[PDB]
Design a protein around this motif. Structure first.
Motif, mmCIF file in Angstrom:
data_model
loop_
_atom_site.group_PDB
_atom_site.id
_atom_site.type_symbol
_atom_site.label_atom_id
_atom_site.label_comp_id
_atom_site.label_asym_id
_atom_site.label_seq_id
_atom_site.Cartn_x
_atom_site.Cartn_y
_atom_site.Cartn_z
ATOM 1 N N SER A 5 0.837 -1.184 0.000
ATOM 2 C CA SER A 5 0.000 0.000 0.000
ATOM 3 C C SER A 5 0.874 1.236 0.000
ATOM 4 O O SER A 5 1.824 1.339 0.771
ATOM 5 C CB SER A 5 -0.935 -0.011 1.203
ATOM 6 O OG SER A 5 -1.873 -1.064 1.072
ATOM 7 N N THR A 6 0.564 2.160 -0.901
ATOM 8 C CA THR A 6 1.354 3.369 -1.057
ATOM 9 C C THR A 6 0.436 4.550 -1.362
ATOM 10 O O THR A 6 -0.783 4.398 -1.471
ATOM 11 C CB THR A 6 2.426 3.222 -2.178
ATOM 12 O OG1 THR A 6 1.808 3.291 -3.468
ATOM 13 C CG2 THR A 6 3.173 1.899 -2.060
ATOM 14 N N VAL A 7 1.041 5.728 -1.479
ATOM 15 C CA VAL A 7 0.314 6.959 -1.762
ATOM 16 C C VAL A 7 0.928 7.635 -2.977
ATOM 17 O O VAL A 7 2.106 8.007 -2.972
ATOM 18 C CB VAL A 7 0.327 7.917 -0.559
ATOM 19 C CG1 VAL A 7 -0.331 9.259 -0.905
ATOM 20 C CG2 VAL A 7 -0.396 7.281 0.598
ATOM 21 N N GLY A 8 0.111 7.776 -4.015
ATOM 22 C CA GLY A 8 0.498 8.476 -5.221
ATOM 23 C C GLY A 8 -0.049 9.887 -5.194
ATOM 24 O O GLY A 8 -0.858 10.242 -4.333
ATOM 25 N N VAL A 9 0.412 10.688 -6.146
ATOM 26 C CA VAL A 9 -0.007 12.071 -6.283
ATOM 27 C C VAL A 9 -0.394 12.271 -7.738
ATOM 28 O O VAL A 9 0.183 11.647 -8.628
ATOM 29 C CB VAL A 9 1.119 13.049 -5.857
ATOM 30 C CG1 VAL A 9 2.417 12.750 -6.602
ATOM 31 C CG2 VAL A 9 0.693 14.502 -6.046
ATOM 32 N N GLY A 10 -1.384 13.117 -7.983
ATOM 33 C CA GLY A 10 -1.791 13.404 -9.343
ATOM 34 C C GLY A 10 -2.740 14.573 -9.445
ATOM 35 O O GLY A 10 -3.042 15.238 -8.455
ATOM 36 N N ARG A 11 -3.213 14.795 -10.666
ATOM 37 C CA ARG A 11 -4.059 15.920 -11.009
ATOM 38 C C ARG A 11 -5.428 15.405 -11.450
ATOM 39 O O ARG A 11 -5.515 14.457 -12.229
ATOM 40 C CB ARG A 11 -3.385 16.737 -12.115
ATOM 41 C CG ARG A 11 -3.915 18.127 -12.315
ATOM 42 C CD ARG A 11 -2.984 18.901 -13.222
ATOM 43 N NE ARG A 11 -1.715 19.240 -12.558
ATOM 44 C CZ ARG A 11 -0.510 19.231 -13.138
ATOM 45 N NH1 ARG A 11 -0.361 18.902 -14.419
ATOM 46 N NH2 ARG A 11 0.566 19.556 -12.429
ATOM 47 N N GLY A 12 -6.486 16.021 -10.937
ATOM 48 C CA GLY A 12 -7.841 15.646 -11.290
ATOM 49 C C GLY A 12 -8.303 16.303 -12.577
ATOM 50 O O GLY A 12 -7.545 17.028 -13.232
ATOM 51 N N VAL A 13 -9.556 16.051 -12.944
ATOM 52 C CA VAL A 13 -10.119 16.580 -14.183
ATOM 53 C C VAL A 13 -10.148 18.109 -14.187
ATOM 54 O O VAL A 13 -9.957 18.720 -15.230
ATOM 55 C CB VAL A 13 -11.545 16.030 -14.428
ATOM 56 C CG1 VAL A 13 -12.173 16.648 -15.681
ATOM 57 C CG2 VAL A 13 -11.500 14.517 -14.569
ATOM 58 N N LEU A 14 -10.377 18.723 -13.026
ATOM 59 C CA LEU A 14 -10.402 20.181 -12.924
ATOM 60 C C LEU A 14 -9.039 20.771 -12.568
ATOM 61 O O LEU A 14 -8.951 21.932 -12.168
ATOM 62 C CB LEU A 14 -11.437 20.626 -11.893
ATOM 63 C CG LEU A 14 -12.858 20.106 -12.117
ATOM 64 C CD1 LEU A 14 -13.807 20.810 -11.174
ATOM 65 C CD2 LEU A 14 -13.321 20.283 -13.562
ATOM 66 N N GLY A 15 -7.984 19.977 -12.716
ATOM 67 C CA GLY A 15 -6.627 20.478 -12.583
ATOM 68 C C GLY A 15 -6.143 20.574 -11.152
ATOM 69 O O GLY A 15 -5.068 21.119 -10.893
ATOM 70 N N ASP A 16 -6.934 20.044 -10.224
ATOM 71 C CA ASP A 16 -6.612 20.134 -8.806
ATOM 72 C C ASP A 16 -5.733 18.959 -8.382
ATOM 73 O O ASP A 16 -5.975 17.814 -8.767
ATOM 74 C CB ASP A 16 -7.887 20.186 -7.962
ATOM 75 C CG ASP A 16 -8.766 18.966 -8.141
ATOM 76 O OD1 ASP A 16 -8.892 18.473 -9.279
ATOM 77 O OD2 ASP A 16 -9.346 18.507 -7.140
ATOM 78 N N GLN A 17 -4.705 19.255 -7.594
ATOM 79 C CA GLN A 17 -3.744 18.243 -7.181
ATOM 80 C C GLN A 17 -4.325 17.401 -6.061
ATOM 81 O O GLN A 17 -5.162 17.867 -5.283
ATOM 82 C CB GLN A 17 -2.429 18.884 -6.749
ATOM 83 C CG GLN A 17 -1.341 17.876 -6.441
ATOM 84 C CD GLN A 17 0.050 18.483 -6.450
ATOM 85 O OE1 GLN A 17 0.381 19.307 -7.307
ATOM 86 N NE2 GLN A 17 0.875 18.076 -5.493
ATOM 87 N N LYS A 18 -3.867 16.159 -5.977
ATOM 88 C CA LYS A 18 -4.625 15.132 -5.290
ATOM 89 C C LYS A 18 -3.775 13.942 -4.884
ATOM 90 O O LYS A 18 -3.131 13.338 -5.731
ATOM 91 C CB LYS A 18 -5.743 14.660 -6.218
ATOM 92 C CG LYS A 18 -6.970 14.176 -5.529
ATOM 93 C CD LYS A 18 -8.169 14.280 -6.452
ATOM 94 C CE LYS A 18 -8.602 15.719 -6.628
ATOM 95 N NZ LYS A 18 -9.957 15.813 -7.211
ATOM 96 N N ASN A 19 -3.789 13.593 -3.599
ATOM 97 C CA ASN A 19 -3.175 12.350 -3.149
ATOM 98 C C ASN A 19 -4.163 11.196 -3.280
ATOM 99 O O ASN A 19 -5.344 11.326 -2.949
ATOM 100 C CB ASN A 19 -2.685 12.463 -1.704
ATOM 101 C CG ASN A 19 -1.491 13.392 -1.558
ATOM 102 O OD1 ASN A 19 -0.667 13.523 -2.462
ATOM 103 N ND2 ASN A 19 -1.389 14.036 -0.404
ATOM 104 N N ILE A 20 -3.669 10.069 -3.773
ATOM 105 C CA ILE A 20 -4.503 8.903 -4.016
ATOM 106 C C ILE A 20 -3.803 7.656 -3.492
ATOM 107 O O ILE A 20 -2.575 7.552 -3.537
ATOM 108 C CB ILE A 20 -4.829 8.746 -5.514
ATOM 109 C CG1 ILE A 20 -3.554 8.892 -6.348
ATOM 110 C CG2 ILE A 20 -5.849 9.791 -5.941
ATOM 111 C CD1 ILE A 20 -3.703 8.465 -7.766
ATOM 112 N N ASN A 21 -4.600 6.726 -2.977
ATOM 113 C CA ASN A 21 -4.088 5.476 -2.437
ATOM 114 C C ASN A 21 -3.895 4.456 -3.538
ATOM 115 O O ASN A 21 -4.840 4.117 -4.256
ATOM 116 C CB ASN A 21 -5.030 4.922 -1.377
ATOM 117 C CG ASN A 21 -5.125 5.817 -0.164
ATOM 118 O OD1 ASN A 21 -4.194 5.890 0.644
ATOM 119 N ND2 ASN A 21 -6.247 6.509 -0.030
#
Ligand SMILES: [Ca+2]
Ligand SMILES: [Ca+2]
Ligand SMILES: [Ca+2]
Ligand SMILES: [Ca+2]
Ligand SMILES: [Zn+2]
Length: 315
Positions: A5-21
């Motif tokens: 289990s880890t934590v990634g980072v990325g950008r959503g559809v509206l350009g907002d940054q976001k941590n994801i499991n």
């Protein structure tokens, strides 16, 4: 899918940054092991074969435009899970932590999203009417709530039963949006019609703004839309809005009791009283009984539920 289990980072559809499991094993997979038996997000690769491929990524960074629908589908599935867990003590949609599966990039130019009985599916939109529909938290929660409904009340997707089904999804879709905190009583506003500001697919506060009925007298009785399941939902949505926020509607005044109590009442209705063939009248009865259970027969809450259904002409 057996990994760490880890934590990634990325950008959503509206350009907002976001941590994801995510889950690491050679690749980083959109697999969230922190919530029940998992949240898994798939790539449908512009085709209609489902679920597609479990979303694999090389570096646990999801900033490519292609990643954006997946990031939001994954993330908002998590938020919706948290809502039902934290607010209603419900463990996933089946109540026993069933894995929540979503596919993005479904088909081409596909201007919709749906729960297919097994999983969620999101189109990317055509870029004109819709952008990727996972970008809307109320949309994600709307569709996920269809699963909750199917495992509980089992409302038939047809006529008044279907309209209640739709309204339940709009109601809890909105309550998740408020839970996540740019909240409103509109549906799909975040991913609907880029280029045109201020609109939405449906309005709970004012369903007539987009031609939907805000009164039982104005209900649709034709055959389209499975007997108007997305149309007549406006009648229940307005009733819900009035329960929460209050107001005077066709000369009938309603004292609001807040969104938290709206949610408790309708959740109890959904899971204790509603059945597959419930109509609007039976919904009223279920909501009145639920409020009675929680707050008592002489309570303001019961009165406001009555007032609200009176206001939209549901006796
Ligand atoms: Ca990457
Ligand atoms: Ca909003
Ligand atoms: Ca909204
Ligand atoms: Ca718009
Ligand atoms: Zn729906």
């Amino acid at each position: 899918i057996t990994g760490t289990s880890t934590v990634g980072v990325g950008r959503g559809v509206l350009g907002d940054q976001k941590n994801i499991n995510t889950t690491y094993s050679t690749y980083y997979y959109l697999q969230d092991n922190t919530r029940g038996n998992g949240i898994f997000t798939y790539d449908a690769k512009y085709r209609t074969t489902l679920p597609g491929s479990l979303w694999a990524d090389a570096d646990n960074q999801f900033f490519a435009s292609y990643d954006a629908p997946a990031v939001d589908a994954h993330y908002y599935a998590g938020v919706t899970y948290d809502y039902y867990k934290n607010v209603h003590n419900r463990l996933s949609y089946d109540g026993n932590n069933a894995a929540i599966r979503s596919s993005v990039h479904y088909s081409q130019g596909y201007n919709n999203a749906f729960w297919n009985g097994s999983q969620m599916v999101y189109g990317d939109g055509d870029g004109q009417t819709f952008i990727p529909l996972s970008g809307g938290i109320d949309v994600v929660a709307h569709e996920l709530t269809h699963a909750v409904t199917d495992y509980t009340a089992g409302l038939i997707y047809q006529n008044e039963s279907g309209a209640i089904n739709e309204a339940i999804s709009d109601i809890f879709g909105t309550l998740v949006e408020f839970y996540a905190n740019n909240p409103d009583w509109e549906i799909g506003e975040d991913v609907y019609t880029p280029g045109i500001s201020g609109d939405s697919l449906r309005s709970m506060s004012d369903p007539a703004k987009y031609g939907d009925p805000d009164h039982y007298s104005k209900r649709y009785t034709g055959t389209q839309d499975n007997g108007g399941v997305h149309i007549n939902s406006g009648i229940i949505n307005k009733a819900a809005y009035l329960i929460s926020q209050g107001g005077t509607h066709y000369g009938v005044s309603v004292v609001g009791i807040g969104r938290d109590k709206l949610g408790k009442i309708f959740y109890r209705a959904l899971t204790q009283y509603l059945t597959p063939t419930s109509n609007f009248s039976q919904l009223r009865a279920a909501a009145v009984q639920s409020a009675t259970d929680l707050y008592g027969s002489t309570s303001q809450e019961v009165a406001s539920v009555k007032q609200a259904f009176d206001a939209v002409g549901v006796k």
